[PDB]
mmCIF file of C-alpha atoms and ligand atoms in Angstrom:
data_model
loop_
_atom_site.group_PDB
_atom_site.id
_atom_site.type_symbol
_atom_site.label_atom_id
_atom_site.label_comp_id
_atom_site.label_asym_id
_atom_site.label_seq_id
_atom_site.Cartn_x
_atom_site.Cartn_y
_atom_site.Cartn_z
ATOM 1 C CA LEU Q 1 0.000 0.000 0.000
ATOM 2 C CA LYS Q 2 1.598 3.287 -1.019
ATOM 3 C CA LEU Q 3 0.591 6.416 0.890
ATOM 4 C CA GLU Q 4 -0.537 9.108 -1.571
ATOM 5 C CA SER Q 5 -2.302 11.729 0.486
ATOM 6 C CA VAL Q 6 -3.116 12.786 4.019
ATOM 7 C CA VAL Q 7 -5.585 15.259 5.555
ATOM 8 C CA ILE Q 8 -5.308 16.015 9.249
ATOM 9 C CA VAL Q 9 -8.219 17.576 11.050
ATOM 10 C CA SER Q 10 -6.738 18.875 14.349
ATOM 11 C CA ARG Q 11 -8.130 20.451 17.457
ATOM 12 C CA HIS Q 12 -6.162 23.471 18.541
ATOM 13 C CA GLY Q 13 -3.599 22.834 21.263
ATOM 14 C CA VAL Q 14 -3.702 23.566 24.989
ATOM 15 C CA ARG Q 15 -5.466 26.795 25.713
ATOM 16 C CA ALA Q 16 -6.558 28.853 28.669
ATOM 17 C CA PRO Q 17 -10.174 28.831 29.669
ATOM 18 C CA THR Q 18 -12.540 30.644 27.279
ATOM 19 C CA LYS Q 19 -14.461 32.172 30.181
ATOM 20 C CA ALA Q 20 -14.331 32.973 33.909
ATOM 21 C CA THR Q 21 -17.911 33.207 35.235
ATOM 22 C CA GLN Q 22 -19.472 33.934 38.618
ATOM 23 C CA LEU Q 23 -21.045 30.476 38.567
ATOM 24 C CA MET Q 24 -17.531 29.018 38.335
ATOM 25 C CA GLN Q 25 -16.655 30.882 41.559
ATOM 26 C CA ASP Q 26 -19.835 29.960 43.370
ATOM 27 C CA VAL Q 27 -19.444 26.166 42.997
ATOM 28 C CA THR Q 28 -16.075 25.876 44.794
ATOM 29 C CA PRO Q 29 -14.550 27.571 47.924
ATOM 30 C CA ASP Q 30 -11.153 27.346 46.257
ATOM 31 C CA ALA Q 31 -9.558 29.812 43.798
ATOM 32 C CA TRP Q 32 -9.178 28.810 40.153
ATOM 33 C CA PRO Q 33 -5.547 28.988 39.156
ATOM 34 C CA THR Q 34 -4.723 31.789 36.646
ATOM 35 C CA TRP Q 35 -3.358 31.176 33.192
ATOM 36 C CA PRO Q 36 -0.264 32.786 31.475
ATOM 37 C CA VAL Q 37 -2.297 34.092 28.454
ATOM 38 C CA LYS Q 38 -5.587 35.814 27.696
ATOM 39 C CA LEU Q 39 -8.852 33.894 27.818
ATOM 40 C CA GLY Q 40 -8.989 31.268 25.064
ATOM 41 C CA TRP Q 41 -5.447 31.714 23.701
ATOM 42 C CA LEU Q 42 -2.950 28.932 23.080
ATOM 43 C CA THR Q 43 -0.253 28.659 25.678
ATOM 44 C CA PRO Q 44 3.385 28.486 24.690
ATOM 45 C CA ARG Q 45 3.296 24.956 26.138
ATOM 46 C CA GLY Q 46 0.198 24.290 23.971
ATOM 47 C CA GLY Q 47 2.284 25.265 20.939
ATOM 48 C CA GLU Q 48 5.155 23.087 21.991
ATOM 49 C CA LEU Q 49 2.938 20.001 22.260
ATOM 50 C CA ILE Q 50 1.470 20.565 18.767
ATOM 51 C CA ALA Q 51 4.980 21.046 17.343
ATOM 52 C CA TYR Q 52 5.865 17.598 18.802
ATOM 53 C CA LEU Q 53 2.964 16.107 16.738
ATOM 54 C CA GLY Q 54 4.365 17.962 13.681
ATOM 55 C CA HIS Q 55 7.813 16.524 14.259
ATOM 56 C CA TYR Q 56 6.256 13.091 14.704
ATOM 57 C CA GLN Q 57 4.167 13.429 11.574
ATOM 58 C CA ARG Q 58 7.175 14.464 9.563
ATOM 59 C CA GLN Q 59 9.164 11.415 10.683
ATOM 60 C CA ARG Q 60 6.207 9.145 10.082
ATOM 61 C CA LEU Q 61 5.450 10.661 6.681
ATOM 62 C CA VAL Q 62 9.094 10.479 5.638
ATOM 63 C CA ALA Q 63 9.058 6.744 6.533
ATOM 64 C CA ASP Q 64 5.866 6.368 4.428
ATOM 65 C CA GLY Q 65 7.734 7.926 1.460
ATOM 66 C CA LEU Q 66 5.352 10.941 1.172
ATOM 67 C CA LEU Q 67 7.705 13.741 2.234
ATOM 68 C CA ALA Q 68 11.445 13.992 1.785
ATOM 69 C CA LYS Q 69 13.879 13.430 4.617
ATOM 70 C CA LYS Q 70 15.895 16.588 4.000
ATOM 71 C CA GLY Q 71 14.950 20.096 3.041
ATOM 72 C CA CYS Q 72 11.664 21.906 3.027
ATOM 73 C CA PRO Q 73 8.750 20.286 1.354
ATOM 74 C CA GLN Q 74 8.291 21.577 -2.178
ATOM 75 C CA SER Q 75 5.907 24.462 -2.568
ATOM 76 C CA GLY Q 76 2.268 23.579 -2.103
ATOM 77 C CA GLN Q 77 3.193 20.056 -1.035
ATOM 78 C CA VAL Q 78 2.098 20.924 2.518
ATOM 79 C CA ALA Q 79 -0.934 23.240 3.041
ATOM 80 C CA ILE Q 80 -2.388 24.551 6.362
ATOM 81 C CA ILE Q 81 -5.822 25.999 6.848
ATOM 82 C CA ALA Q 82 -6.885 27.363 10.214
ATOM 83 C CA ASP Q 83 -9.925 28.932 11.745
ATOM 84 C CA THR Q 84 -9.612 32.631 12.599
ATOM 85 C CA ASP Q 85 -9.206 32.116 16.397
ATOM 86 C CA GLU Q 86 -5.838 33.003 17.815
ATOM 87 C CA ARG Q 87 -5.660 29.508 19.237
ATOM 88 C CA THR Q 88 -6.256 27.774 15.877
ATOM 89 C CA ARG Q 89 -3.992 30.081 13.916
ATOM 90 C CA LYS Q 90 -1.210 29.461 16.428
ATOM 91 C CA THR Q 91 -1.815 25.750 16.340
ATOM 92 C CA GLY Q 92 -1.238 25.925 12.591
ATOM 93 C CA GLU Q 93 2.024 27.849 13.106
ATOM 94 C CA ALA Q 94 3.178 25.330 15.732
ATOM 95 C CA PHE Q 95 2.414 22.305 13.577
ATOM 96 C CA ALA Q 96 4.363 23.868 10.610
ATOM 97 C CA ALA Q 97 7.239 24.586 12.968
ATOM 98 C CA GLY Q 98 7.367 20.890 14.116
ATOM 99 C CA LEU Q 99 6.768 19.422 10.668
ATOM 100 C CA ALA Q 100 9.140 21.667 8.685
ATOM 101 C CA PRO Q 101 11.133 24.015 10.842
ATOM 102 C CA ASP Q 102 12.334 27.251 9.174
ATOM 103 C CA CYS Q 103 10.357 26.535 6.046
ATOM 104 C CA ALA Q 104 7.788 29.222 6.838
ATOM 105 C CA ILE Q 105 4.816 27.229 5.635
ATOM 106 C CA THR Q 106 1.875 29.631 5.216
ATOM 107 C CA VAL Q 107 -1.049 29.252 7.683
ATOM 108 C CA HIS Q 108 -4.053 30.202 5.636
ATOM 109 C CA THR Q 109 -7.230 31.652 6.954
ATOM 110 C CA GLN Q 110 -10.278 33.311 5.514
ATOM 111 C CA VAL Q 111 -9.915 36.873 4.252
ATOM 112 C CA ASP Q 112 -11.605 38.349 7.377
ATOM 113 C CA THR Q 113 -9.934 37.516 10.705
ATOM 114 C CA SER Q 114 -12.451 39.268 12.959
ATOM 115 C CA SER Q 115 -15.536 37.310 11.811
ATOM 116 C CA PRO Q 116 -16.367 33.590 11.979
ATOM 117 C CA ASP Q 117 -15.311 31.226 9.168
ATOM 118 C CA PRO Q 118 -18.254 29.092 7.996
ATOM 119 C CA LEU Q 119 -15.979 26.191 7.020
ATOM 120 C CA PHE Q 120 -15.700 25.534 10.798
ATOM 121 C CA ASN Q 121 -19.414 25.883 11.407
ATOM 122 C CA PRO Q 122 -21.926 26.947 8.748
ATOM 123 C CA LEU Q 123 -24.670 27.406 11.351
ATOM 124 C CA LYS Q 124 -22.797 30.345 12.938
ATOM 125 C CA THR Q 125 -22.885 32.467 9.735
ATOM 126 C CA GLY Q 126 -26.416 31.359 8.896
ATOM 127 C CA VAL Q 127 -25.366 29.387 5.858
ATOM 128 C CA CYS Q 128 -28.078 26.889 6.894
ATOM 129 C CA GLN Q 129 -30.306 26.169 9.868
ATOM 130 C CA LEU Q 130 -31.209 23.280 12.125
ATOM 131 C CA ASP Q 131 -34.706 21.807 12.064
ATOM 132 C CA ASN Q 132 -35.815 22.561 15.608
ATOM 133 C CA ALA Q 133 -38.377 19.770 16.212
ATOM 134 C CA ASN Q 134 -36.241 17.084 14.674
ATOM 135 C CA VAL Q 135 -33.045 17.973 16.458
ATOM 136 C CA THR Q 136 -34.913 18.231 19.818
ATOM 137 C CA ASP Q 137 -36.343 14.715 19.467
ATOM 138 C CA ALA Q 138 -33.069 13.241 18.250
ATOM 139 C CA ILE Q 139 -30.990 14.675 21.104
ATOM 140 C CA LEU Q 140 -33.594 13.761 23.823
ATOM 141 C CA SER Q 141 -33.665 10.254 22.428
ATOM 142 C CA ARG Q 142 -29.864 10.045 22.598
ATOM 143 C CA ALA Q 143 -30.003 11.348 26.195
ATOM 144 C CA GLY Q 144 -32.107 8.285 27.342
ATOM 145 C CA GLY Q 145 -35.383 10.125 26.685
ATOM 146 C CA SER Q 146 -34.924 13.229 28.775
ATOM 147 C CA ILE Q 147 -32.082 15.260 30.218
ATOM 148 C CA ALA Q 148 -33.102 13.996 33.696
ATOM 149 C CA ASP Q 149 -32.519 10.436 32.419
ATOM 150 C CA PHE Q 150 -29.153 11.496 31.117
ATOM 151 C CA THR Q 151 -27.934 12.977 34.427
ATOM 152 C CA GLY Q 152 -29.574 10.088 36.340
ATOM 153 C CA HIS Q 153 -27.222 7.567 34.697
ATOM 154 C CA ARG Q 154 -24.140 9.801 35.455
ATOM 155 C CA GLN Q 155 -24.723 10.546 39.162
ATOM 156 C CA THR Q 156 -21.401 9.035 40.136
ATOM 157 C CA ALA Q 157 -19.417 11.379 37.872
ATOM 158 C CA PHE Q 158 -21.294 14.457 39.091
ATOM 159 C CA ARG Q 159 -20.446 13.479 42.639
ATOM 160 C CA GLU Q 160 -16.798 12.944 41.634
ATOM 161 C CA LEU Q 161 -16.784 16.490 40.258
ATOM 162 C CA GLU Q 162 -18.377 17.812 43.473
ATOM 163 C CA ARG Q 163 -15.644 16.139 45.503
ATOM 164 C CA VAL Q 164 -12.940 17.783 43.392
ATOM 165 C CA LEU Q 165 -14.630 21.140 43.658
ATOM 166 C CA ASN Q 166 -15.418 20.727 47.331
ATOM 167 C CA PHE Q 167 -18.830 21.663 46.241
ATOM 168 C CA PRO Q 168 -20.360 21.079 49.682
ATOM 169 C CA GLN Q 169 -18.411 24.003 51.072
ATOM 170 C CA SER Q 170 -19.125 26.170 48.072
ATOM 171 C CA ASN Q 171 -21.281 29.291 48.154
ATOM 172 C CA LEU Q 172 -24.010 27.771 45.995
ATOM 173 C CA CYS Q 173 -24.212 24.835 48.345
ATOM 174 C CA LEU Q 174 -24.104 26.780 51.591
ATOM 175 C CA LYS Q 175 -27.104 28.830 50.446
ATOM 176 C CA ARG Q 176 -28.643 25.544 49.031
ATOM 177 C CA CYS Q 177 -26.643 20.271 47.882
ATOM 178 C CA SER Q 178 -26.166 18.838 44.383
ATOM 179 C CA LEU Q 179 -25.118 20.196 41.050
ATOM 180 C CA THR Q 180 -27.680 18.474 38.865
ATOM 181 C CA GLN Q 181 -30.536 19.743 41.136
ATOM 182 C CA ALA Q 182 -29.072 23.152 42.107
ATOM 183 C CA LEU Q 183 -28.555 23.812 38.391
ATOM 184 C CA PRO Q 184 -31.297 22.183 36.334
ATOM 185 C CA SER Q 185 -30.103 21.397 32.839
ATOM 186 C CA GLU Q 186 -32.393 22.026 29.880
ATOM 187 C CA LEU Q 187 -31.917 21.507 26.131
ATOM 188 C CA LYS Q 188 -32.011 24.817 24.289
ATOM 189 C CA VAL Q 189 -32.327 24.278 20.516
ATOM 190 C CA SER Q 190 -32.211 27.250 18.167
ATOM 191 C CA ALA Q 191 -31.825 27.605 14.343
ATOM 192 C CA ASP Q 192 -28.019 28.087 14.623
ATOM 193 C CA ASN Q 193 -27.176 26.187 17.824
ATOM 194 C CA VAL Q 194 -28.017 23.528 20.393
ATOM 195 C CA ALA Q 195 -27.050 24.035 23.996
ATOM 196 C CA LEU Q 196 -27.532 22.531 27.440
ATOM 197 C CA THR Q 197 -27.799 24.892 30.397
ATOM 198 C CA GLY Q 198 -27.032 24.248 34.038
ATOM 199 C CA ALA Q 199 -25.053 21.311 35.480
ATOM 200 C CA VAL Q 200 -24.505 19.467 32.251
ATOM 201 C CA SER Q 201 -22.672 22.352 30.480
ATOM 202 C CA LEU Q 202 -20.897 23.604 33.624
ATOM 203 C CA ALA Q 203 -19.666 20.057 34.268
ATOM 204 C CA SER Q 204 -18.430 19.654 30.644
ATOM 205 C CA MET Q 205 -16.563 22.969 30.876
ATOM 206 C CA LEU Q 206 -15.034 22.458 34.349
ATOM 207 C CA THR Q 207 -13.803 18.950 33.691
ATOM 208 C CA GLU Q 208 -12.120 20.085 30.447
ATOM 209 C CA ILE Q 209 -10.436 22.916 32.495
ATOM 210 C CA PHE Q 210 -9.036 20.338 34.905
ATOM 211 C CA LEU Q 211 -7.599 18.389 31.885
ATOM 212 C CA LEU Q 212 -6.041 21.520 30.508
ATOM 213 C CA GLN Q 213 -4.413 22.321 33.875
ATOM 214 C CA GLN Q 214 -2.885 18.848 33.851
ATOM 215 C CA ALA Q 215 -1.776 19.156 30.259
ATOM 216 C CA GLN Q 216 -0.381 22.700 30.984
ATOM 217 C CA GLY Q 217 1.957 21.244 33.604
ATOM 218 C CA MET Q 218 0.229 23.117 36.481
ATOM 219 C CA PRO Q 219 1.355 21.856 39.881
ATOM 220 C CA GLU Q 220 -2.012 20.734 41.332
ATOM 221 C CA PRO Q 221 -4.899 20.447 38.924
ATOM 222 C CA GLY Q 222 -8.272 20.175 40.695
ATOM 223 C CA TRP Q 223 -6.689 21.686 43.831
ATOM 224 C CA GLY Q 224 -4.731 18.510 44.187
ATOM 225 C CA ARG Q 225 -7.884 16.405 44.539
ATOM 226 C CA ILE Q 226 -7.509 14.430 41.308
ATOM 227 C CA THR Q 227 -5.051 11.628 42.127
ATOM 228 C CA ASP Q 228 -5.502 8.730 39.740
ATOM 229 C CA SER Q 229 -6.466 7.738 36.195
ATOM 230 C CA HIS Q 230 -9.923 6.454 37.238
ATOM 231 C CA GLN Q 231 -10.802 9.938 38.577
ATOM 232 C CA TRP Q 232 -9.622 11.599 35.325
ATOM 233 C CA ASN Q 233 -11.687 9.160 33.259
ATOM 234 C CA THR Q 234 -14.721 9.667 35.473
ATOM 235 C CA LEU Q 235 -14.501 13.468 35.470
ATOM 236 C CA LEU Q 236 -14.069 13.711 31.693
ATOM 237 C CA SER Q 237 -17.017 11.423 30.886
ATOM 238 C CA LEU Q 238 -19.160 14.484 31.601
ATOM 239 C CA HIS Q 239 -17.314 16.390 28.903
ATOM 240 C CA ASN Q 240 -17.567 13.468 26.480
ATOM 241 C CA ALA Q 241 -21.247 13.014 27.338
ATOM 242 C CA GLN Q 242 -22.222 16.582 26.504
ATOM 243 C CA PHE Q 243 -20.306 16.247 23.193
ATOM 244 C CA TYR Q 244 -22.019 12.871 22.506
ATOM 245 C CA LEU Q 245 -25.310 14.715 22.782
ATOM 246 C CA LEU Q 246 -24.620 18.150 21.267
ATOM 247 C CA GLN Q 247 -21.920 17.477 18.683
ATOM 248 C CA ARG Q 248 -22.031 13.817 17.647
ATOM 249 C CA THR Q 249 -25.841 13.543 17.163
ATOM 250 C CA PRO Q 250 -26.175 13.281 13.353
ATOM 251 C CA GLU Q 251 -29.157 15.621 13.187
ATOM 252 C CA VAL Q 252 -26.726 18.320 14.292
ATOM 253 C CA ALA Q 253 -23.342 16.902 13.178
ATOM 254 C CA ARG Q 254 -24.082 16.448 9.504
ATOM 255 C CA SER Q 255 -25.034 20.117 8.983
ATOM 256 C CA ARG Q 256 -22.236 21.443 11.106
ATOM 257 C CA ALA Q 257 -19.576 19.233 9.418
ATOM 258 C CA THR Q 258 -20.748 19.706 5.831
ATOM 259 C CA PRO Q 259 -18.112 22.218 4.567
ATOM 260 C CA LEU Q 260 -15.366 20.179 6.218
ATOM 261 C CA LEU Q 261 -16.674 17.030 4.611
ATOM 262 C CA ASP Q 262 -16.589 18.765 1.129
ATOM 263 C CA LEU Q 263 -13.069 20.053 1.845
ATOM 264 C CA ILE Q 264 -11.812 16.662 3.038
ATOM 265 C CA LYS Q 265 -13.367 14.863 0.050
ATOM 266 C CA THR Q 266 -11.797 17.382 -2.333
ATOM 267 C CA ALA Q 267 -8.424 17.044 -0.719
ATOM 268 C CA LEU Q 268 -8.484 13.221 -0.981
ATOM 269 C CA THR Q 269 -9.741 12.897 -4.557
ATOM 270 C CA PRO Q 270 -7.233 12.425 -7.383
ATOM 271 C CA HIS Q 271 -7.755 15.436 -9.630
ATOM 272 C CA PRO Q 272 -5.492 17.853 -11.531
ATOM 273 C CA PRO Q 273 -3.967 20.275 -9.019
ATOM 274 C CA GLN Q 274 -6.057 23.367 -8.704
ATOM 275 C CA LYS Q 275 -6.185 26.489 -6.569
ATOM 276 C CA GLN Q 276 -9.369 26.455 -4.456
ATOM 277 C CA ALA Q 277 -10.433 27.326 -0.906
ATOM 278 C CA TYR Q 278 -8.071 29.888 0.682
ATOM 279 C CA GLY Q 279 -6.162 29.923 -2.568
ATOM 280 C CA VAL Q 280 -4.758 26.519 -1.552
ATOM 281 C CA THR Q 281 -3.885 24.227 -4.485
ATOM 282 C CA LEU Q 282 -5.551 20.800 -3.996
ATOM 283 C CA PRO Q 283 -5.145 17.865 -4.077
ATOM 284 C CA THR Q 284 -1.715 17.824 -2.510
ATOM 285 C CA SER Q 285 0.393 15.621 -0.210
ATOM 286 C CA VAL Q 286 -0.445 16.989 3.249
ATOM 287 C CA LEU Q 287 -3.247 19.219 4.348
ATOM 288 C CA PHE Q 288 -3.470 20.251 8.005
ATOM 289 C CA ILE Q 289 -6.695 21.896 9.189
ATOM 290 C CA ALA Q 290 -6.690 23.567 12.633
ATOM 291 C CA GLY Q 291 -10.085 23.818 14.269
ATOM 292 C CA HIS Q 292 -12.074 22.727 17.336
ATOM 293 C CA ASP Q 293 -13.183 19.801 19.382
ATOM 294 C CA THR Q 294 -16.652 20.329 17.999
ATOM 295 C CA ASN Q 295 -15.306 19.759 14.514
ATOM 296 C CA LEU Q 296 -13.717 16.460 15.490
ATOM 297 C CA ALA Q 297 -16.943 15.322 17.070
ATOM 298 C CA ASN Q 298 -19.174 16.614 14.247
ATOM 299 C CA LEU Q 299 -17.075 14.614 11.707
ATOM 300 C CA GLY Q 300 -17.125 11.576 13.907
ATOM 301 C CA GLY Q 301 -20.907 11.551 14.196
ATOM 302 C CA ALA Q 302 -21.516 12.492 10.538
ATOM 303 C CA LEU Q 303 -19.269 9.712 9.360
ATOM 304 C CA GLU Q 304 -20.219 7.186 11.973
ATOM 305 C CA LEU Q 305 -16.654 7.030 13.330
ATOM 306 C CA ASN Q 306 -16.741 5.871 16.954
ATOM 307 C CA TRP Q 307 -13.877 6.022 19.458
ATOM 308 C CA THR Q 308 -12.556 6.288 22.939
ATOM 309 C CA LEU Q 309 -8.885 7.192 23.480
ATOM 310 C CA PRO Q 310 -6.763 4.998 25.726
ATOM 311 C CA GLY Q 311 -4.796 7.147 28.286
ATOM 312 C CA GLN Q 312 -6.510 10.318 27.164
ATOM 313 C CA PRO Q 313 -9.786 10.971 29.108
ATOM 314 C CA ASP Q 314 -11.031 13.683 26.646
ATOM 315 C CA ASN Q 315 -12.287 11.963 23.425
ATOM 316 C CA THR Q 316 -11.513 15.243 21.587
ATOM 317 C CA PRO Q 317 -8.288 16.341 23.257
ATOM 318 C CA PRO Q 318 -5.997 19.346 22.644
ATOM 319 C CA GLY Q 319 -4.084 18.537 19.420
ATOM 320 C CA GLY Q 320 -6.143 15.444 18.743
ATOM 321 C CA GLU Q 321 -6.065 14.613 15.079
ATOM 322 C CA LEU Q 322 -8.667 13.004 12.822
ATOM 323 C CA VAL Q 323 -6.340 11.655 10.099
ATOM 324 C CA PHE Q 324 -7.729 10.742 6.672
ATOM 325 C CA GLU Q 325 -5.279 8.916 4.344
ATOM 326 C CA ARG Q 326 -5.588 7.877 0.743
ATOM 327 C CA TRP Q 327 -3.594 4.746 0.085
ATOM 328 C CA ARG Q 328 -2.907 3.082 -3.269
ATOM 329 C CA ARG Q 329 -2.964 -0.706 -3.221
ATOM 330 C CA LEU Q 330 -0.214 -1.828 -5.589
ATOM 331 C CA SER Q 331 -1.653 -5.270 -6.570
ATOM 332 C CA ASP Q 332 -4.392 -3.568 -8.650
ATOM 333 C CA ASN Q 333 -3.769 0.189 -8.152
ATOM 334 C CA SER Q 334 -7.058 0.604 -6.323
ATOM 335 C CA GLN Q 335 -7.553 3.610 -4.058
ATOM 336 C CA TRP Q 336 -8.538 3.359 -0.387
ATOM 337 C CA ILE Q 337 -9.329 5.716 2.455
ATOM 338 C CA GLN Q 338 -8.047 5.097 6.036
ATOM 339 C CA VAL Q 339 -9.293 7.086 9.061
ATOM 340 C CA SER Q 340 -7.516 7.280 12.443
ATOM 341 C CA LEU Q 341 -7.476 9.383 15.649
ATOM 342 C CA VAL Q 342 -3.983 10.441 16.606
ATOM 343 C CA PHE Q 343 -3.493 11.916 20.046
ATOM 344 C CA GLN Q 344 -1.121 12.558 22.943
ATOM 345 C CA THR Q 345 -2.034 10.620 26.009
ATOM 346 C CA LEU Q 346 -2.618 12.765 29.103
ATOM 347 C CA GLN Q 347 0.670 11.592 30.545
ATOM 348 C CA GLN Q 348 2.426 12.610 27.309
ATOM 349 C CA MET Q 349 0.930 16.085 27.742
ATOM 350 C CA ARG Q 350 1.712 16.179 31.504
ATOM 351 C CA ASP Q 351 5.361 15.132 30.972
ATOM 352 C CA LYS Q 352 5.722 17.169 27.763
ATOM 353 C CA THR Q 353 7.187 14.152 26.131
ATOM 354 C CA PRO Q 354 8.971 14.591 22.733
ATOM 355 C CA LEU Q 355 7.257 12.337 20.170
ATOM 356 C CA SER Q 356 8.998 10.225 17.580
ATOM 357 C CA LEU Q 357 8.841 6.899 15.845
ATOM 358 C CA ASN Q 358 10.061 5.123 18.946
ATOM 359 C CA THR Q 359 7.860 7.283 21.189
ATOM 360 C CA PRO Q 360 4.740 7.764 19.172
ATOM 361 C CA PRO Q 361 1.456 9.439 20.071
ATOM 362 C CA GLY Q 362 -1.481 7.152 20.754
ATOM 363 C CA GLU Q 363 -3.454 6.182 17.685
ATOM 364 C CA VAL Q 364 -6.846 4.545 17.204
ATOM 365 C CA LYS Q 365 -7.726 2.929 13.881
ATOM 366 C CA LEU Q 366 -11.243 3.755 12.983
ATOM 367 C CA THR Q 367 -13.767 2.177 10.700
ATOM 368 C CA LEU Q 368 -16.421 4.047 8.610
ATOM 369 C CA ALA Q 369 -19.461 2.192 9.853
ATOM 370 C CA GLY Q 370 -21.494 2.776 6.687
ATOM 371 C CA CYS Q 371 -18.763 1.576 4.317
ATOM 372 C CA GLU Q 372 -19.792 -1.447 2.211
ATOM 373 C CA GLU Q 373 -16.508 -1.803 0.298
ATOM 374 C CA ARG Q 374 -13.705 -2.477 2.702
ATOM 375 C CA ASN Q 375 -10.237 -3.937 2.343
ATOM 376 C CA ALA Q 376 -8.456 -6.334 4.758
ATOM 377 C CA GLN Q 377 -7.041 -3.429 6.643
ATOM 378 C CA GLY Q 378 -10.462 -1.918 7.360
ATOM 379 C CA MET Q 379 -10.031 0.811 4.728
ATOM 380 C CA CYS Q 380 -12.978 2.013 2.693
ATOM 381 C CA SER Q 381 -12.688 2.234 -1.101
ATOM 382 C CA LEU Q 382 -12.473 5.725 -2.571
ATOM 383 C CA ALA Q 383 -15.860 5.199 -4.239
ATOM 384 C CA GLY Q 384 -17.362 3.957 -0.887
ATOM 385 C CA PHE Q 385 -15.928 6.974 0.921
ATOM 386 C CA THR Q 386 -17.276 9.223 -1.728
ATOM 387 C CA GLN Q 387 -20.800 7.830 -1.435
ATOM 388 C CA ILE Q 388 -20.672 8.129 2.390
ATOM 389 C CA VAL Q 389 -19.641 11.760 2.152
ATOM 390 C CA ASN Q 390 -22.443 12.388 -0.413
ATOM 391 C CA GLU Q 391 -25.119 10.850 1.790
ATOM 392 C CA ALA Q 392 -23.834 12.360 4.990
ATOM 393 C CA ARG Q 393 -23.488 15.960 3.818
ATOM 394 C CA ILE Q 394 -26.434 18.390 3.911
ATOM 395 C CA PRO Q 395 -26.390 20.346 0.574
ATOM 396 C CA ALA Q 396 -28.027 23.448 2.021
ATOM 397 C CA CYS Q 397 -25.016 23.741 4.436
ATOM 398 C CA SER Q 398 -22.349 23.804 1.690
ATOM 399 C CA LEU Q 399 -20.227 26.859 1.012
HETATM 400 NI NI1 NI H 401 -13.632 29.103 15.727
HETATM 401 NI NI1 NI H 402 -32.000 5.615 30.640
HETATM 402 NI NI1 NI H 403 -1.434 30.898 -0.234
HETATM 403 NI NI1 NI H 404 -12.655 17.699 24.234
#
């Protein structure tokens, strides 16, 4: 099998919290540790971790014969697209720096940096709209039938989070007991967005913040109250759970992932090279796309890619990569698509461990669950991939 093309959909790297709310203060007696950069921005450490994945990918791709061992990749051979957020732009820069240091690979973004890019979510620019009644029913059904059913099955994790927070001594509690009841969680479904209020979204946010502390190398994440891998896995199930509901549900995911699906399909299809989105010439050898956890999850649910990540409690971790490869099978020159999730384990983030062929990131081989035409290695034919993308995408959400 000869590797011919690769498209990497990456979450941005380690970032500071996006917000600092009063509710965050009220649910713990302890002080949240401060971060070295503005709200939502990538930390220098964040950048360093992504650059390790770049270095790893270069080694790996050199071994696969796709990129040369010495020198800068030839022009256009590597392309990088990034959302307009500081944190995604800087993730792009960091990945280029690890992959091809001193080659100054351009990090492309949309023309306008101060407005949202619909490639990363077409709902947010009103390219298309969710069907309210359908999405409501679909998400409630995925929750176990109600949001009360959903929190009912996760009581243990909520109580783990309360322990870490010391929620019983918190201001909310002293006035008045439990997160899921003190903060009732409701599904809010609008034309451009689905959201959960209350305990479910607070829990998803706070547990991700603990993970980021750990990954940032902070001395005592969770005020020192998170002391083993079972606790990490337990805490982060609340994050994963909200994403299961709000981002993986196909009635949301398909719409929200549609421009990325078109871009990925374009990048992976043999075709004469041609300047398109962002003035990037496609197809080419490597395309790196720097976005958001939501994007990873939206693709996963649109494409019926399922995973959990061993040693990495967040299913959609900082720098986690959804890797699409086109491989040519030499026996009959047929074309095949492989999909994988490449990620640093939490310990690899915590120890800032340099990545390499002998010390690789974790990796989970995925299967496209709708694919009818599969090879021995679990890859989906190009034609099978193509049909899956065509059925999954929502035309009204295309750019
Ligand atoms: Ni964004
Ligand atoms: Ni149930
Ligand atoms: Ni350019
Ligand atoms: Ni995540």
